[PDB]
Amino acid sequence: YVVFV
Amino acid sequence: YVVFV
Amino acid sequence: YVVFV
Amino acid sequence: YVVFV
Amino acid sequence: YVVFV
Amino acid sequence: YVVFV
Amino acid sequence: YVVFV
Amino acid sequence: YVVFV
Amino acid sequence: YVVFV
Amino acid sequence: YVVFV
Amino acid sequence: YVVFV
Amino acid sequence: YVVFV
């Protein structure tokens, strides 16, 4: 899982 | 916002 | 699953 | 908005 | 499934 | 709006 | 859009 | 299976 | 977007 | 399985 | 984003 | 398994 925000 | 899962 | 928003 | 799934 | 909006 | 499914 | 299957 | 979009 | 499977 | 996006 | 699996 | 992001 990867998130950029 | 970017998600990879 | 990939999302860009 | 872009989704690939 | 692919959506662009 | 574009969908491919 | 291009698909080969 | 190959897709380019 | 490019997928090979 | 290979994806470039 | 690049994945090989 | 290899990911570059």
Return d(Cα J1, Cα I1) in angstroms, integer.
Answer: 13
Whether I and J touch, i.e. at least 3 CB pairs below 8 A, reads as yes
Return d(Cα I1, Cα J5) in angstroms, integer.
Answer: 5
Measured between beta carbons, the chain D residues lying within 8 angstroms of E5 are 1
Return d(Cα L1, Cα G2) in angstroms, integer.
Answer: 26
Solved using: X-ray
With CA atoms as reference, report the closest residue to C2 among D5, L4, F5: D5
Q: How far is CA G2 from the centre of its chain?
A: 4
- For residue B4, report the phi and psi dihedrals to the nearest 5 degrees: -120, 120
Q: Distance, in angstroms, between A5 CA and closest chain B CA?
A: 5
Neighbours of F1 (CB within 10 A): 6
* Side chain identity at residue J3, one-letter code: V
Question: Do K4 and J1 lie within an 8 Å CB cutoff?
Answer: yes
With CA atoms as reference, report the closest residue to F4 among I1, I2, B3, G1: G1
